Design a protein around this nucleic acid. Structure first.
Ligand SMILES: [Mg+2]
Ligand SMILES: [Zn+2]
Ligand SMILES: [Zn+2]
Ligand SMILES: [Zn+2]
Ligand SMILES: [Zn+2]
Lengths: 1232, 652
RNA sequence: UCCGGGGCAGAAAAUUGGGUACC
RNA sequence: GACUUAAUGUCACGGUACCCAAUUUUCUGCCCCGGA
């Protein structure tokens, strides 16, 4: 009589603000949320309130369940027949109800004996309230024969506590892009999901029908339900202010952004990365320690202060502490640096007819429950607006895109997202569906909406709350092949392999083959790949879910309906339904044995199966691959400046993230390489904008208006177990052009995956091609696949240095002599007795004339006039070559006997000897810049002398490094590029082919090694003796066999020179041959000629490479094997000769069979690189540095070759000292 | 200053977009770029922006909405926001003199269009007061500013006197005929002089495509005249409808505008009110108005944005239509064989009264009767909702629909309106296309079907009426094997007919004008674009657009389809229904007669239809419906459901 | 009047721009 | 109680936060004269 019922929600139910019926029309949000749980503001201030559900909404759901219950039983219930009720109020007789029914009404052949009236009414007319004193206008509660009171939440209460504002979406099926959106409040069902209310029934004739309908009400307020009858943030902000102020005091403000990114990333590592001091400690000897974690904030290192902060802010937990501190550091950084929509925001909120639907008498209606798990085969992303925006009641971003989570931070698959993707695939399976019209007066009777109205899903939440990995994406500038300005954003993505509890309820008369097809389409089984594209970022392969462990059960609703109501349709107990066996099934629920198989489904085979065609292939990288993850490099104990990207993969079997992160090339990088590869060949990349554009690139890869027709997945490394050391440590350094030593700040290292030609990395990746791909576009993707296979587009960073060069692609089955002779120099040739002594290094004073080309060559296309191709070169070692492997400071395992003595092996990857392409590129860059009179790209401006001006002031202004493309780029900076312009030449790693493997020396403990003399940093004070002196030029080292002196005095070197003062290193023998690949794009006929000339200058001219250049080591001669160009033809020698001549002609223009020696700067440059002992020659010039004084070690008696005497201005005045240093091969013991 | 250069960049981009020579593709980009330059500095400066720069914000906002064409039936929310966004900044110029003169000039026109596209936010009284102050502010420079004439003329629509201002604008050079005709009607109550000027407007309307603003304005003017009891809309609605016919004749698709249906409803109503031979000449003119409305179907802009001789010809129509939308702001009806009667149906949205125009060739008499389609449509929706759920089990809902067809349309059984033995050709309108008019029960005890007395043929429109091999019977088939076996391998079928799995190109292959063509496949309906509706044949299927161009052989062929029309056309969510099925696509490419089922029936019923057509093609379909199974509708209603499902589309 | 010494070990830039309102 | 429903009519499970963007660009693991 006075039923008190409790209504419980089993998924996040929608909430809306309460507005009176007349005041509701003014607000679109509340009119849309008329079937939601109403929120009213208690008190004032719009802060707290009380959540409730209108009894009219519970009544509408109940009388809807009475309709279905009576329709299922053909108008009867437990023997008492019921008429069709009434659902039409004439406007003339009385006013309309507050809510009009747009939906079809289930009706039946009425079998009640008499027409229902006030005296005698059927249980349906009792529950409707057709004949009782209660009417459209409420007067008193006693008038209601059946009364539904308001349902107050069982738990003032803040809106933000109970509900979270979320933006839902309407995605256009044809374009794949959101048509519009709308915001709701998804209230918390776990804490505020129980609503209690009183149903007062004053006619017991409908008691049995009413109580059954309460158990038949499946969903309410947007959520499945069962109806049963019964500041830390402010303190973190202040100390983040402290951090930013400290960084500003250290003039490292730009490091605050990277620190904020690293701190937010620290949530992944956990408490132990701070409380165990697991952060990288920096270099072993560096006074400054780590460049970021050891920045002293207030007299203490940043790691220690982070430990103190964690101790202070332990209450909020590690994840909240790192998210807030990372955000607070971001928030403050934005206000320290700085930081409206036209046409408004596309936030859209949406004659009555009675349509009686009469199911045929005797039809059998069933409810099919499909319970499985949605396994994320790819890193999923369910988009959500920023937490500042996603605040209910009130309507800077550290993370540009946030994934959707719970109050408990568990990853969430929304019912809306699962329904929208199911509707998308149902429309695909049917082949015909509607663009969902909102607020239409007539139910959409399309084949999709008909099934969607019978389909109910669940809000799936993973039992996994670890923080999301951040994917950074950039946009390449097509013209410069660098990052587009302002194009750097991060996305929170959930781990792949994460399982979500999938629930699908279909209540109907027959199970459609289209829903079976979609379920089969989403299923993963044996060879099939699950194809449940859920959520956003599908083009970057985010959210390819797979349905697994699918059990389809059947509710016989015509016979076993009392049991269905008793079990409440297994609502909220669906996870129990998945684990439970067929013997433990609830009464009336039976497994669906007639679930059509995958190949027996007509909609699946023509509509869903061919929709996305996978193209799986194995990228084979024969180079060290580095898809840099700088943020994760700061937080990992390696202390490497750049480390390879790795992803967190969730193992469903172990119910945890796999201990070893999966190394992969991100799908975004995988996608972007293709988009560039297709764009550059079709010229679409060069288009200024792509708004309302239907070009080849925009049709394939989508644009702001159309979704991509191709979805790219990550290139997972499937070779991790093969490599003994997967990640190679490669040190890099920028050598000053003026002084052959390292720059002040420019020294770094990378941690790429240790790929090599003999042991390449295999990156198995795949992309999905949409059905209906044009034949021309299918060729475009294949051509892009060929471009990457040919090695045009290296993967990851440092491509021009030789990183990530693709050796080949394996598609899965399921789919020349340069005969120039330089005359040399007179002094070394005349002195056949080698009496005179030469300075080891010499300076090339080309001059201040630098030709800066303001017309920068765009990377956005393969220009037909310009030359793009590849050079195959052989590098022969004329003298022993030293390329030390700095990954192991004790690579020779001899530091134990000599502590602190730095010993390295020859540079190698996976045990095969190498020359890094950076070494080749850098050594070729200095020669090219010297040849072309380019700027001093790497130069120590900040260094001083011992004075009035720094070296930058003494250097000519035109010789200064090119900054920005506005002023133009010098030929060296135009070829090899700058920070603003990616270089057009790529140098690969040089693989060792043949020759005497090592220079064996018996005295050395390792026979293949050699202990060098002390190599001290170049000091400009000698080259610039006085303030009136200028920069002498670019330092170059003469080719000589001075290594023999080092080789023959190995015992004396070790016994006298301090062990830590010098190094021991594995040195190659002369005649060793290395082969490296030089890939060039968009080269002039002269630029390729100059590059070809730079590689192989002449017969008796070589380069200086690697360690020990002043000691005669590293004289390497580069020989061109083959030059290949494409528009892939093999350019012959005659055409190569043509290219080189044009480079000579271009050098003539700048000056104002080519004999290079006529040009004064090249002649000076070429005698520097001329090899006196090359071919057949008896010249053995004595080239070494002067000793400090006569008493210094190594001084030879009978000679005045000392720095004390040469440094003295009386014997050697400053002008002739610089005159000597400028002139190559000038004798220095008998000083010229 | 910085603001001076800002406008110098933004005030010349707008005029570059404001000129008519700029293409709409470029114009939208130009306005957005200028607005980005303009609004971008508004974000930086907020109220620091001067009134002159605040003036030009609304100019971009007014112009940006011009490029926001309606992508569907309703006016866009984005276009409404731009007008709302524009009316904000220009209002900011009023509270913050050549500045005020031009401020009220653009504040008012933005509200004029705001009141036009959305009258609820910008009320008529609110709009009246706004432009009334323009008289107070003296926005009466009608010689130089086009917008200025719009102001004094939108005002007299509201009811403002403006007797003094008449002397200026009618002699103003830049006042168009429609505006001049308006200013001649309600500024001074001289209905006579509005006839000549509006005639020039309607005469000039024969060349401006239907997307032009003048088309919507001229119908709105007659919308004002109609209901004013001015006795002048009757002549005017007919006159402009004539201009629509000339303009529309230049794929059988037309530009969609909301006033187009009102134009034809008002022209139809004008003739109906004006309704011996002259008296019957109007009644015939009702059919020509009705036929012209169904001669082509309106395509929503979003549908034509996404669709090659047909392709090349269509893009010209799409380009020409979009340019004109932005330009303004910146067979015989009696040629029927003897013994046939033709019933042209027209549904009036103006008044909830549909009416059927009938032409008895033997009597050479034109007459019409009106019927209430409001209640019949609800009964149709009840059948449509029940059929889509239960198919043949909704037969009981078809009978009450067919009885409702007889009940609300009793003239179909009246001998004077339709003779007892005369063949009836149906030309339905809107939801009557889905109605089984042939099988309708007369509203009387044991009422016989309409189909029993007359053989009924259907035509999407009278414009589809058209005027060789007598032993070649081709059969296409992509249906499942188990449904058609004994019919599949009959001896009559020709060699050029793939009888197990048919392809889209093989349909294009049939030549020599066969007597019978059978296509048995699963049709699929594009719910928005009729051109994209396909007959699923092998891989991909062949669409309405593809059938129009690719298929050429079946000229005069009697076509039989195996795909239900409910799968060929989308379900009806409204009274209007212009989504033409694949059957009429065949009708355009000759194919005299296209017999197909109106809804899903068991494959045996289609089998018997084909086999009975195989024996003698000259047999009337009506006889098969009554002599085999159907015409019962009382005992075993699904049998009546299965038979009546077959209609004959297309009459030669 | 004195007989030796290691350096750099990352620097610069991008850290988000926008688009999307069928009914 | 109210806050906070209207009752012969709530398809809002009537709507995927969707769509675009290569963590990348440049850099030789390099090297000699002094220091008070
Ligand atoms: Mg009542
Ligand atoms: Zn009753
Ligand atoms: Zn629909
Ligand atoms: Zn494009
Ligand atoms: Zn440069």
């Amino acid at each position: 009589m006075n039923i008190t019922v409790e209504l419980t929600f089993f998924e996040p139910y929608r909430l809306v603000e309460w507005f009176d019926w007349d005041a509701r029309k003014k607000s679109h949000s509340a009119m849309r949320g008329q079937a939601f749980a109403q929120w009213t503001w208690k008190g004032k201030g719009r802060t707290a309130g009380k959540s409730f559900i209108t009894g009219t909404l519970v009544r509408s759901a109940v009388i809807k369940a009475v309709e279905e219950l009576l329709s299922l039983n053909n108008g009867k219930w437990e023997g008492v027949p019921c008429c069709n009720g009434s659902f039409q109020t004439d406007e003339s007789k009385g006013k309309k109800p507050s809510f009009l029914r747009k939906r079809h009404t289930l009706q039946w052949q009425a079998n009640n004996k008499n027409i229902c009236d006030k005296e005698e009414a059927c249980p349906f007319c009792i529950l409707l309230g057709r004949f009782d004193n209660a009417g459209k206008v409420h007067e008193r509660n006693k008038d209601y024969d059946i009364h539904f009171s308001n349902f107050d939440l069982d738990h003032d209460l803040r809106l933000v506590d109970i509900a979270s504002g979320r933006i839902l979406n309407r995605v256009d099926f044809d374009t794949g892009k959101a048509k519009d959106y709308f915001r709701t409040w998804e209230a918390d069902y776990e804490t505020y999901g129980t609503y209690t209310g009183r149903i007062t029934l004053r006619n017991e004739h409908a008691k049995k029908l009413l109580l059954a309908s309460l158990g038949f009400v499946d969903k309410l307020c947007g959520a499945l339900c069962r109806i049963e009858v019964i500041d830390h943030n402010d303190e973190l902000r202040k100390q983040a202010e402290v951090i930013v102020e400290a960084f500003k005091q250290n003039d490292k403000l730009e490091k605050i952004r990277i620190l904020a990114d690293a701190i937010r990333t620290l949530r992944l590592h956990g408490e132990g990365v701070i409380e165990k001091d697991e952060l990288p400690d920096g270099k072993e000897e560096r006074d400054k320690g780590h460049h970021l974690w050891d920045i002293k904030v207030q007299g203490t290192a940043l790691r220690t202060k982070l430990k103190e902060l964690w101790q202070s802010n332990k209450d909020i937990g590690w994840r909240k502490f790192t998210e807030m501190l990372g955000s607070n550091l971001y928030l403050i950084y934005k206000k320290e640096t700085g930081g409206f929509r036209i046409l408004g925001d596309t936030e859209y909120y949406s004659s009555d007819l009675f349509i009686p639907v009469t199911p045929p008498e005797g039809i059998e209606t069933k409810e099919w429950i499909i319970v499985g798990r949605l396994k994320a085969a790819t890193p999923f992303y369910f988009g959500v607006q920023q937490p500042s925006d996603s605040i209910p009641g009130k309507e800077n971003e550290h993370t540009s895109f946030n994934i959707l989570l719970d109050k408990e931070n568990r990853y969430r698959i929304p019912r809306s997202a699962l329904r929208g993707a199911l509707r998308r695939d149902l429309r695909t399976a049917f082949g015909s569906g509607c663009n969902v019209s909102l607020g239409g007066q007539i139910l959409c009777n399309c084949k999709v909406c008909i099934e969607m109205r019978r389909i109910t899903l669940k809000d799936s939440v993973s039992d996994f709350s670890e923080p999301p990995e951040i994917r950074y994406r950039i946009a390449k500038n097509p013209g410069t092949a660098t990052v587009e300005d302002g194009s750097l954003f991060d996305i929170e993505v959930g781990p792949e392999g994460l399982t979500f509890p999938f629930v699908l309820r279909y209540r109907g008369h027959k199970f459609p083959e289209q829903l079976s097809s979609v379920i089969r389409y989403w299923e993963e089984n044996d060879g099939k790949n699950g194809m449940a594209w859920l959520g956003g970022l599908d083009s970057t392969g985010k959210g390819r879910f797979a349905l697994k462990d699918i059990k389809i059960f059947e509710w016989d609703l015509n016979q076993k309906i009392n049991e269905y109501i008793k079990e409440r349709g297994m609502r909220g107990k669906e996870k129990e339904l998945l684990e439970m066996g067929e013997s433990s099934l609830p009464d009336g629920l039976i497994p669906y044995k007639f679930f059509e198989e995958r190949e027996c489904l007509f909609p699946y085979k023509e509509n869903l199966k061919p929709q996305w065609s996978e193209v799986q292939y194995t990228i084979e990288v024969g180079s060290p691959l580095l898809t840099a993850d700088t943020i994760s490099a700061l937080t990992e104990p390696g202390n490497r400046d750049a480390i390879a990207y790795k992803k967190r993969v969730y193992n469903d079997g172990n119910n945890a993230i796999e201990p070893e992160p999966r190394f992969a090339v991100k799908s975004e990088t995988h996608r972007g390489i293709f988009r560039t590869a297709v764009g550059r060949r079709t010229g679409d990349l060069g288009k200024e904008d792509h708004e309302d554009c239907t070009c080849d690139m925009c049709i394939i890869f989508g644009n702001e208006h159309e979704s991509s027709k191709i979805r790219f997945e990550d290139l997972e490394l499937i070779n991790g177990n093969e490599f003994e050391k997967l990640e190679k440590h490669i040190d890099h350094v920028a050598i000053d052009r003026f002084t052959g030593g390292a720059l002040d700040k420019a020294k770094f290292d990378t941690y790429p995956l240790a790929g090599s030609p003999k042991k390449p990395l295999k990156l198995k990746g795949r992309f999905w091609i949409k059905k209906g791909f044009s034949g021309d576009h299918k060729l475009l993707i294949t051509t892009a696949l060929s471009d990457i296979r040919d090695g045009l587009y290296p993967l990851g960073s440092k491509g021009g240095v030789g990183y990530g060069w693709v050796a080949g692609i394996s598609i899965d089955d399921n789919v020349i002599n340069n005969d120039y002779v330089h005359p040399g120099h007179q002094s070394p040739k005349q002195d056949h007795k080698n009496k005179n002594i030469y300075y080891p290094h010499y300076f090339l004073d080309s001059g201040s004339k630098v030709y800066r080309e303001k017309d920068i060559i765009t990377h956005e296309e393969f220009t037909e006039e310009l030359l793009s191709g590849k050079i195959n070169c052989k590098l022969e070692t004329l003298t022993p070559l030293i390329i030390p492997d700095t990954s192991d400071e004790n690579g020779l395992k001899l530091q134990g006997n000599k502590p602190g003595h730095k010993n390295y092996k020859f540079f190698n990857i996976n045990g095969e000897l190498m020359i890094p392409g950076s070494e080749l590129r850098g050594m070729l860059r200095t020669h090219f810049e010297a040849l072309t009179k380019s700027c001093f790209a790497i130069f120590g401006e900040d260094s001083t002398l011992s004075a009035s001006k720094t070296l930058g002031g003494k250097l000519d202004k035109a010789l200064h490094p090119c900054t920005g493309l506005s002023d133009g780029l010098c030929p060296g900076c135009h070829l090899f590029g700058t920070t603003d312009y990616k270089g057009r030449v790529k140098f690969g790693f040089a693989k060792y082919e043949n020759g005497p493997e090592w220079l064996i020396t018996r005295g050395n403990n390792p026979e293949r090694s050699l202990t060098l003399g002390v190599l001290e940093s170049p000091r400009p004070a000698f080259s610039i003796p006085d303030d009136e002196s200028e920069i002498p030029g670019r330092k170059f080292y003469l080719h000589h066999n001075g290594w023999r002196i080092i080789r023959q005095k190995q015992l004396e070197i070790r016994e006298t020179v301090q062990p830590e003062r010098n190094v021991t290193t594995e040195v190659m023998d002369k005649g060793n041959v290395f082969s490296f690949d030089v890939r060039f794009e968009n080269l002039r006929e002269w630029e390729l000629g100059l590059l070809l000339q730079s590689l192989d200058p002449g017969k008796n001219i070589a380069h200086k490479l690697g360690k020990g250049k002043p000691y005669g080591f590293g004289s390497v001669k580069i020989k061109i094997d083959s030059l290949h160009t494409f528009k892939i033809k093999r350019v012959p020698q005659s055409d190569i000769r043509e290219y080189i001549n044009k480079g000579y002609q271009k050098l003539i223009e700048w000056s104002g069979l080519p004999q290079w020696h006529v040009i004064p700067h090249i002649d000076k440059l070429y005698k520097l690189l001329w090899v006196p002992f090359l071919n057949d020659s008896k010249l053995e010039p004595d080239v070494r540095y002067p000793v400090l004084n006569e008493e210094s070690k190594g001084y030879i008696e009978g000679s005045d070759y000392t720095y004390k005497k040469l440094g003295d201005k009386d014997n050697l005045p400053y002008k002739t000292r610089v005159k000597g240093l400028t002139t190559p091969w000038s004798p220095w013991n008998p000083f010229q | 200053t910085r603001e001076d250069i800002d406008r110098k960049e933004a005030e010349r981009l707008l005029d570059e977009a404001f000129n008519p020579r700029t293409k709409p593709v470029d114009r939208k980009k130009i306005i957005n770029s200028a607005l980005k330059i303009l609004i971008g500095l508004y974000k930086e400066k907020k109220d620091d922006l001067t009134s002159a720069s605040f003036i030009s914000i609304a100019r971009a906002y007014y112009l940006v909405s011009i490029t926001i064409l309606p992508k569907g039936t309703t006016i866009p929310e984005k276009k409404k926001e731009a007008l709302r966004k524009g009316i904000e900044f220009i209002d900011r110029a009023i509270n913050k003199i050549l500045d005020s003169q031009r401020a009220f000039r653009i504040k008012s026109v933005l509200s004029i269009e705001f009141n036009r596209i959305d009258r609820e936010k910008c009320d008529n009284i609110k709009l009246k007061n706004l432009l009334n102050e323009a008289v107070d502010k003296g926005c009466t420079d009608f010689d130089t500013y086009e917008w200025d004439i719009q102001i004094a003329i939108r005002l007299c629509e509201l009811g403002v006197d403006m007797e003094g201002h008449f002397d200026n604008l009618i002699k103003s050079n830049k006042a168009n005929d429609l505006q001049k005709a308006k200013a001649y009607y309600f500024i001074k109550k001289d209905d006579h002089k509005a006839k000549e000027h509006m005639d020039k407007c309607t005469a000039s309307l024969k060349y401006t495509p239907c997307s032009h603003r003048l088309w919507d304005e001229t119908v709105g003017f007659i919308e004002r005249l109609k209901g004013d009891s001015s006795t002048l809309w009757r002549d005017f609605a007919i006159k402009t409808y004539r201009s629509c016919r000339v303009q529309e004749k230049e794929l059988r698709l037309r530009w969609y505008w909301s006033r187009h249906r009102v134009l034809y409803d008002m022209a139809f109503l004008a003739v109906k009110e004006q309704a011996v031979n002259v008296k019957q000449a109007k009644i015939k003119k009702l059919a020509e108005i009705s036929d012209s409305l169904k001669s082509r179907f309106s395509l929503r802009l979003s549908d034509m944005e996404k669709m090659d001789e047909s392709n090349h010809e269509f893009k010209k129509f799409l380009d020409k239509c979009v340019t004109a939308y932005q330009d303004g702001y910146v067979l015989e009806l009696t040629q029927v064989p003897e013994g046939w009667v033709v019933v042209h149906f027209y549904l009036n949205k103006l008044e909830g009264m549909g009416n059927a125009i009938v032409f008895d060739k033997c009597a050479n008499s034109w007459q019409y009767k009106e019927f209430q389609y409001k209640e019949l449509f609800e009964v149709f929706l009840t059948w449509q909702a029940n059929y889509n759920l239960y198919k043949e089990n909704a037969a009981e809902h078809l009978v009450t629909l067919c009885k409702k067809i007889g009940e609300t349309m009793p003239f179909l059984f009246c001998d004077n309106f339709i003779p007892n033995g005369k063949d009836v050709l149906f030309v339905p309108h809107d939801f009557l296309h889905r109605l089984p008019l042939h099988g309708s029960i007369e509203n009387k005890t044991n009422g016989k079907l309409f189909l029993e007395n007359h053989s009924c043929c259907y035509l999407p429109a009278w414009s589809f009426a058209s005027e060789s091999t007598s032993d070649e019977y081709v059969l296409l088939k992509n249906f499942d094997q188990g449904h058609f076996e004994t019919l599949q391998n009959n001896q009559i079928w020709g060699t050029q007919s793939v009888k197990d799995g048919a392809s889209s190109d093989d349909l294009e292959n049939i030549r020599n004008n066969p007597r019978l063509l059978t296509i048995l496949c699963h049709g699929e309906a594009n719910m928005s674009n009729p051109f994209r509706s396909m007959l699923k044949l092998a891989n991909g299927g062949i669409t309405y657009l593809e059938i129009l161009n690719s298929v050429k052989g079946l000229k005069g062929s009697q076509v039989i389809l195996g795909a239900c029309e409910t799968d060929l056309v989308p379900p009806l969510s409204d009274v209007m229904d212009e989504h033409y099925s694949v059957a009429t696509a065949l009708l355009l490419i000759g194919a005299a007669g296209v017999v197909g089922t109106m809804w899903k029936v068991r494959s045996n019923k289609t089998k018997s239809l084909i086999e009975w057509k195989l024996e003698n093609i000259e047999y009337k379909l009506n006889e098969w419906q009554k002599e085999t199974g159907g015409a019962a509708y009382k005992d075993h209603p699904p049998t009546f459901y299965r038979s009546i499902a077959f209609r004959s589309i297309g009459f030669p």
